[PDB]
Design an enzyme around this catalytic site. Structure first.
Site, PDB file in Angstrom:
ATOM      1  N   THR A  12       2.705  -8.056   4.747  1.00 27.57           N
ATOM      2  CA  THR A  12       3.761  -7.790   3.776  1.00 27.57           C
ATOM      3  C   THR A  12       5.132  -8.125   4.357  1.00 27.57           C
ATOM      4  O   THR A  12       5.935  -8.817   3.721  1.00 27.57           O
ATOM      5  CB  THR A  12       3.710  -6.326   3.333  1.00 27.57           C
ATOM      6  N   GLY A  13       5.415  -7.635   5.567  1.00 26.30           N
ATOM      7  CA  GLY A  13       6.690  -7.935   6.199  1.00 26.30           C
ATOM      8  C   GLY A  13       6.950  -9.424   6.336  1.00 26.30           C
ATOM      9  O   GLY A  13       8.091  -9.870   6.217  1.00 26.30           O
ATOM     10  N   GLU A  35       0.862  -1.170   0.000  1.00 24.62           N
ATOM     11  CA  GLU A  35       0.000   0.000   0.000  1.00 24.62           C
ATOM     12  C   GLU A  35       0.902   1.225   0.000  1.00 24.62           C
ATOM     13  O   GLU A  35       2.082   1.130   0.359  1.00 24.62           O
ATOM     14  CB  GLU A  35      -0.946   0.004   1.214  1.00 24.62           C
ATOM     15  N   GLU A  86      33.584 -11.014   9.156  1.00 25.48           N
ATOM     16  CA  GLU A  86      34.499 -11.719  10.046  1.00 25.48           C
ATOM     17  C   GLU A  86      33.823 -12.058  11.372  1.00 25.48           C
ATOM     18  O   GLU A  86      34.001 -13.163  11.898  1.00 25.48           O
ATOM     19  CB  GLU A  86      35.755 -10.875  10.264  1.00 25.48           C
TER      20      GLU A  86
HETATM   21  N1  LIG Z   1       9.782  -1.008  15.539  1.00 17.56           N
HETATM   22  C1  LIG Z   1       8.807  -0.774  14.659  1.00 17.56           C
HETATM   23  N2  LIG Z   1       7.804  -1.703  14.491  1.00 17.56           N
HETATM   24  C2  LIG Z   1       6.813  -1.472  13.598  1.00 17.56           C
HETATM   25  C3  LIG Z   1       6.784  -0.307  12.852  1.00 17.56           C
HETATM   26  N3  LIG Z   1       5.693  -0.346  12.057  1.00 17.56           N
HETATM   27  C4  LIG Z   1       5.035  -1.506  12.278  1.00 17.56           C
HETATM   28  N4  LIG Z   1       5.710  -2.204  13.244  1.00 17.56           N
HETATM   29  C5  LIG Z   1       5.375  -3.534  13.769  1.00 17.56           C
HETATM   30  O1  LIG Z   1       5.136  -4.361  12.645  1.00 17.56           O
HETATM   31  C6  LIG Z   1       4.079  -5.266  12.914  1.00 17.56           C
HETATM   32  C7  LIG Z   1       2.979  -5.010  11.893  1.00 17.56           C
HETATM   33  O2  LIG Z   1       3.539  -5.135  10.604  1.00 17.56           O
HETATM   34  P1  LIG Z   1       3.642  -3.952   9.524  1.00 17.56           P
HETATM   35  O3  LIG Z   1       5.060  -3.692   9.085  1.00 17.56           O
HETATM   36  O4  LIG Z   1       3.003  -2.675  10.031  1.00 17.56           O
HETATM   37  O5  LIG Z   1       2.705  -4.551   8.351  1.00 17.56           O
HETATM   38  P2  LIG Z   1       3.095  -4.606   6.795  1.00 17.56           P
HETATM   39  O6  LIG Z   1       4.483  -5.185   6.595  1.00 17.56           O
HETATM   40  O7  LIG Z   1       3.009  -3.233   6.191  1.00 17.56           O
HETATM   41  O8  LIG Z   1       2.038  -5.636   6.161  1.00 17.56           O
HETATM   42  P3  LIG Z   1       0.501  -5.280   5.815  1.00 17.56           P
HETATM   43  O9  LIG Z   1       0.181  -3.860   6.227  1.00 17.56           O
HETATM   44  O10 LIG Z   1      -0.363  -6.288   6.511  1.00 17.56           O
HETATM   45  O11 LIG Z   1       0.352  -5.420   4.319  1.00 17.56           O
HETATM   46  C8  LIG Z   1       3.601  -4.984  14.328  1.00 17.56           C
HETATM   47  O12 LIG Z   1       4.262  -5.878  15.201  1.00 17.56           O
HETATM   48  C9  LIG Z   1       4.089  -3.578  14.583  1.00 17.56           C
HETATM   49  O13 LIG Z   1       4.342  -3.369  15.949  1.00 17.56           O
HETATM   50  C10 LIG Z   1       7.791   0.635  13.017  1.00 17.56           C
HETATM   51  O14 LIG Z   1       7.784   1.673  12.357  1.00 17.56           O
HETATM   52  N5  LIG Z   1       8.799   0.392  13.928  1.00 17.56           N
HETATM   53 MG   LIG Z   2       1.245  -2.126   5.850  1.00 19.99          MG
END
Ligand SMILES: Nc1nc2c(ncn2[C@@H]2O[C@H](COP(=O)(O)OP(=O)(O)OP(=O)(O)O)[C@@H](O)[C@H]2O)c(=O)[nH]1
Ligand SMILES: [Mg+2]
Ligand SMILES: C=C(CC(=O)OC)C(=O)N[C@@H](c1ccccc1)[C@@H](O)C(=O)O[C@H]1C[C@@]2(O)[C@@H](OC(=O)c3ccccc3)[C@@H]3[C@]4(OC(C)=O)CO[C@@H]4C[C@H](O)[C@@]3(C)C(=O)[C@H](O)C(=C1C)C2(C)C
Ligand SMILES: Nc1nc2c(ncn2[C@@H]2O[C@H](COP(=O)(O)OP(=O)(O)O)[C@@H](O)[C@H]2O)c(=O)[nH]1
Ligand SMILES: [Mg+2]
Lengths: 426, 440, 67
Positions: free
Chosen positions: B145-146, B71, B254
């Site tokens: 996504t992550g 997105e 290393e």
């Molecule tokens: N440390 C940190 N954690 C984050 C951040 N943004 C999201 N999170 C964590 O990431 C997880 C949620 O995943 P996101 O990265 O927001 O989701 P996405 O990868 O965009 O995937 P979708 O939105 O479902 O398509 C949760 O555990 C959040 O606490 C950030 O900016 N910093």
């Molecule tokens: Mg997202």
């Protein structure tokens, strides 16, 4: 952005739908003429979700108005914000539905559904990335109940991978006199279990009890009931309409709230609620979890929470919100299923409603919702036991098997809620 | 030569990437428009910072980075933010509909529509490298996504770039800032799918970072901005050996030799010090001994676990700033006499030390005080399996009822993928037990 | 010794190529299996809905007969 298409069907559907558009138009700074006149860019950041932008910097609700009689929609067009709706999105017939689910679902409603589907396609085709639909209707009448669920099925055929969301008003003898409403409601719930992803159960019995017992309104009107509904609908759609991290779209809300496909009927709640003849974060939290504040006539302490979404609105300490939310969870851990860890999610929006400095909206998926369906089933069987008033429905071509099947499906739904209420981890 | 390509996936990966690249620019003297008045090599060079920055003929220093999200709203903030001129539009890739916190959507339904474009953009960066060393992939465990798109990307990178090293910075979920009930599902699925494709992964427990911000920086309710600025300091300490050169500077590869004894055992525990507010630092100068001691306090770890209840397989100390080996050795000698440090019987007990001389820096308006010396400890301890155990237990509670599983099956996944992923996690936990048992 | 040296590096090449090949085939199977599963779930959904559409026509046909 991620557009939502709104549909309102029948008398109740169009009246609560009109109130919903009045409330959120004020929140987003849109006047009855469709011009923006607010003072915050946050009002426009996600305005695409519910409004199209037309010529002349005007914002038009992505809303379709459906009814089998012109009466209610005439009063909407002549209402406060009647001039904001697209005139081509008024789709109405003349025969009416006579509080008959069969007429709404199979005959007169089927006569009109193709004309409604034509305008749905035009609104959907003009969407950058349509996320789904929200429908407002009652289950006790004919058009909203019968034709509304027909619309859900026909729309789902053309948009099978989009989210279907409804605000469904459940009938109660305290508000409505008509005797066939348990039939219409049972036939409608059978459709909702199969063809919607998330349904807010707006119980007219709970709305009446809140107006009578809590608000001290001796003779509650439909305006009083709809006043509670518009505040609730504004609350539960805040995450969709303003920038936020939690349940920011219909699909993420569904993934957080629906652990099993059929158990998608939510108990909404609002705080504060008090009579006019007379606030801290802890008091907001306890009220929002209290049965008296729920918009479904169910006591959550008679069941267990599968999932909960809580939205706090106004300027307040997030640390205090965090502490109080974990406080109510640990102190009432018996009422949250242990096999769904961290099942309560909390959001905070800085912009509060018009007349309040702090408010809270509750969305609960509780197994206690079976109390609502048991009440409807009890009224259904009391009439179906004696084949009472069936000629209104069989005269439209229905067979008694369809009533038996609808009754069994709702009894099955009740059994499902009880199964997961009794389930344990260890 | 020796270039590193960074890939930031999803909201967490992108926002952490924003923090990291802002910090890199400050460390190297790179302005928001990409100009670097100290770099007299216009349009190229083989300086140490060129591992992370390419150079245009107009003198712009461009991150070797791709940002990808399903997105657009998070990356749109990069496109209009302070460092918009740093990146070319082709490096910032967005879809229109996200994965809805659903691994299946990120790996299959939605991810499949953008994976080929993402690989094309990565290939464009790789073609500019004279000796590409590998990839750094930033992503959350919990997001759709992550989790889902990262694993798809890692699978495709193994095919397109064989055994070229891929390192992760992975955001482990915490209930205080979590947005989805199904994050344990997404975490186990992506850990299983990525395990054979990752050479080294640095897990970052959001709850550990959250607690450090509350305890050490006096922040009542840390935001992602608070968390990400701390995370970028830790990432910067780890990558400092790649971006700076010196005579006490030990390359990350290393350290990696010592940190990965078996392919699957590739999850180092990071510990960072000092994390201190400006009001507290204004009195203290924290010595080498003090910051080194803080590395063995569990409260300073990036992943919550108890290394006193595990065994060590490696211990690395990465110093930056005003640090000389004489003070490091004296600090280490003190630590060994007074601390609970038990190694497995099959590995040497020494500590591997690297010193990078440029002092750390902070972003203006942050909460971390600017200090003269800092240290990141990277240890391979069996205790990090505790983080897997907590996730595996939440997985088991929900999966025993098949809660929310229909969302994944609806997108084409099979129940067998859940059990296959969970069994791999069970074997991984058993692997950590086995490596820590004495020889015979 | 020279032949052992060439066998070692040939082994390294063969292992790398086989890792690439097996990762490529496994991903191709997964994406195809996922594509088939999701399309089958959509088809079951649409067939259930089309069963409801025919039922709407039998009701209307049954009403017409009783006139
Ligand atoms: N440390 C940190 N954690 C984050 C951040 N943004 C999201 N999170 C964590 O990431 C997880 C949620 O995943 P996101 O990265 O927001 O989701 P996405 O990868 O965009 O995937 P979708 O939105 O479902 O398509 C949760 O555990 C959040 O606490 C950030 O900016 N910093
Ligand atoms: Mg997202
Ligand atoms: C749009 C309308 C009215 C309308 O025209 O619909 C189209 C509206 O009401 N919006 C509000 C809103 C809320 C959430 C999200 C978005 C908007 C809000 O911003 C506002 O103005 O609340 C109104 C609502 C009140 O009537 C009143 O309630 C009622 O008597 C009543 C009667 C029947 C049904 C429901 C309520 C109200 C209550 O209700 C509320 C909501 O707070 C009830 O217990 C709540 C506690 C409030 O202290 C107490 C008691 C008030 O005394 C207060 O002085 C007041 C406010 C702050 C009114 C007297 C004017
Ligand atoms: N809360 C609320 N309920 C309503 C309203 N209008 C009708 N109802 C309820 O809806 C049911 C009747 O359905 P109705 O909308 O009149 O049927 P339809 O117009 O043919 O779809 C009854 O149980 C009423 O209590 C309204 O404005 N607000
Ligand atoms: Mg009526």
């Amino acid at each position: 952005m991620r557009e939502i298409v709104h549909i309102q069907a029948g008398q109740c559907g169009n009246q609560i739908g009109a109130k919903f558009w009045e409330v959120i138009s004020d929140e987003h700074g849109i006047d009855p003429t469709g011009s923006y006149h607010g003072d915050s860019d946050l009002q426009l950041e996600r305005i695409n979700v519910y409004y199209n932008e037309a010529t002349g910097n005007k914002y038009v609700p992505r809303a379709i108005l459906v009814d089998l009689e012109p009466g209610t929609m005439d009063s909407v067009r002549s209402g406060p914000f009647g001039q904001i709706f697209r005139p081509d999105n008024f789709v109405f017939g003349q025969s009416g539905a006579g509080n008959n689910w069969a007429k709404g679902h199979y005959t007169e409603g089927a006569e009109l559904v193709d004309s409604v589907l034509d305008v749905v396609r035009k609104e959907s085709e003009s969407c950058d990335c349509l996320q789904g639909f929200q429908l407002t209707h009652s289950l006790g009448g004919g058009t909203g109940s019968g034709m509304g669920t027909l619309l859900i099925s026909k729309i789902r055929e053309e948009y099978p991978d989009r989210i279907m969301n409804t605000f469904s008003v459940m009938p109660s003898p305290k508000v409505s006199d008509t005797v066939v409403e348990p039939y219409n409601a049972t036939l409608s719930v059978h459709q909702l279990v199969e063809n919607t992803d998330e349904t807010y159960c707006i119980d007219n019995e709970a709305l009446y009890d809140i107006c009578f017992r809590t608000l001290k309104l001796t003779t509650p009107t439909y305006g009083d009931l709809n006043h509670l509904v518009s505040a609730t609908m504004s609350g539960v759609t805040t995450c969709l309409r303003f920038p936020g991290q939690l349940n920011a779209d219909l699909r993420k809300l569904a993934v957080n709230m629906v652990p099993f496909p059929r158990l998608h009927f939510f108990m909404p709640g609002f705080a504060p609620l008090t009579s006019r003849g007379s606030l801290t974060v802890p008091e907001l939290t306890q009220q929002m979890f209290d049965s008296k504040n729920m918009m479904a006539a169910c006591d959550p302490r008679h069941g267990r929470y599968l999932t909960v979404a809580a939205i706090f609105r106004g300027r307040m300490s997030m640390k205090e919100v965090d502490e109080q939310m974990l406080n109510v969870q640990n102190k009432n851990s018996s009422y949250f299923v242990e096999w769904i860890p961290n099942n309560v999610k909390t959001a905070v929006c800085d912009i509060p409603p018009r007349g309040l400095k702090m408010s809270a909206t509750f969305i609960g998926n509780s197994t206690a919702i079976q109390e609502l369906f048991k009440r409807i089933s009890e009224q259904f069987t009391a009439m179906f036991r004696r084949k009472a008033f069936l000629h209104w429905y069989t005269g439209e071509g229905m067979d008694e098997m369809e009533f038996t099947e609808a009754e069994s499906n709702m009894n099955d739904l009740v059994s499902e809620y009880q199964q997961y209420q009794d389930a344990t981890a260890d | 030569m020796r270039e590193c390509i960074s890939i930031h996936v999803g909201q967490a990966g992108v926002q952490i990437g924003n923090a990291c690249w802002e910090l890199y620019c400050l460390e190297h003297g790179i302005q928001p428009d990409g100009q670097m008045p100290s770099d007299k090599t216009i349009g190229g060079g083989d300086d140490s910072f060129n591992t992370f920055f390419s150079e245009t003929g107009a003198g712009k220093h461009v991150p070797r980075a791709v940002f990808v999200d399903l997105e657009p709203t998070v990356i749109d903030e990069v496109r209009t933010g302070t460092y918009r001129q740093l990146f070319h539009p082709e490096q910032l890739i967005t879809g229109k509909e996200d994965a809805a916190n659903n691994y299946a959507r990120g790996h299959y339904t939605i991810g499949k529509e953008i994976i080929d474009l993402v690989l094309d953009r990565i290939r464009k960066l790789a073609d500019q490298c004279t000796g590409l060393q590998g990839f750094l992939v930033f992503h959350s465990f919990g997001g759709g996504t992550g989790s889902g798109f990262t694993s798809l990307l890692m699978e495709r990178l193994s095919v397109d770039y064989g055994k070229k090293s891929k390192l992760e910075f992975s955001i482990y979920p915490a209930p205080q800032v979590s947005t989805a009930v199904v994050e344990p599902y997404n975490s186990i699925l992506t850990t299983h799918t990525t395990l054979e494709h990752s050479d080294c992964a640095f897990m970052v427990d959001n709850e550990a970072i959250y607690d450090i911000c509350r305890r050490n920086l006096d922040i009542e309710r840390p935001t992602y901005t608070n968390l990400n600025r701390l995370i970028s300091q830790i990432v910067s300490s780890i990558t400092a050996s790649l971006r700076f050169d010196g005579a006490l500077n030990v390359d990350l590869t290393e350290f990696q030799t010592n940190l990965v004894p078996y392919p699957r055992i590739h999850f180092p525990l990071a510990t960072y010090a000092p994390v201190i507010s400006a009001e507290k630092a204004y009195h203290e100068q924290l010595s080498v001994a003090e910051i080194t001691n803080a590395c063995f306090e569990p409260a300073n770890q990036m992943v919550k676990c108890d290394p006193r209840h595990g065994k060590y397989m490696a211990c690395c100390l990465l110093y930056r700033g005003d640090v000389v080996p004489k003070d490091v050795n004296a600090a280490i000698a003190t630590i060994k006499t007074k601390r609970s440090i038990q190694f497995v019987d099959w590995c040497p007990t020494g500590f591997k030390v690297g010193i990078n001389y440029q002092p750390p820096t902070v972003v203006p308006g942050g909460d971390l005080a600017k200090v003269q010396r800092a240290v990141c400890m990277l240890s391979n301890t069996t205790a990090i399996a505790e983080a897997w155990a907590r996730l595996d237990h939440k997985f088991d509670l929900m999966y025993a009822k098949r809660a929310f599983v229909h969302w994944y099956v609806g997108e084409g996944m099979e129940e067998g993928e859940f059990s296959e992923a969970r069994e791999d996690m069970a074997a991984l936990e058993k692997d950590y037990e086995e490596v820590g048992v004495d020889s015979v | 010794k020279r032949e052992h040296e060439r066998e070692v590096i040939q082994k390294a090449i063969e292992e790398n190529n086989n890792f690439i090949k097996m990762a490529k085939e496994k991903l191709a199977q997964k994406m195809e299996s996922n594509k088939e599963n999701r399309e089958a779930h959509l088809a079951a959904m649409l067939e259930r809905l089309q069963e409801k559409d025919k039922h709407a026509e039998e009701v209307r046909k049954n009403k017409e007969l009783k006139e």
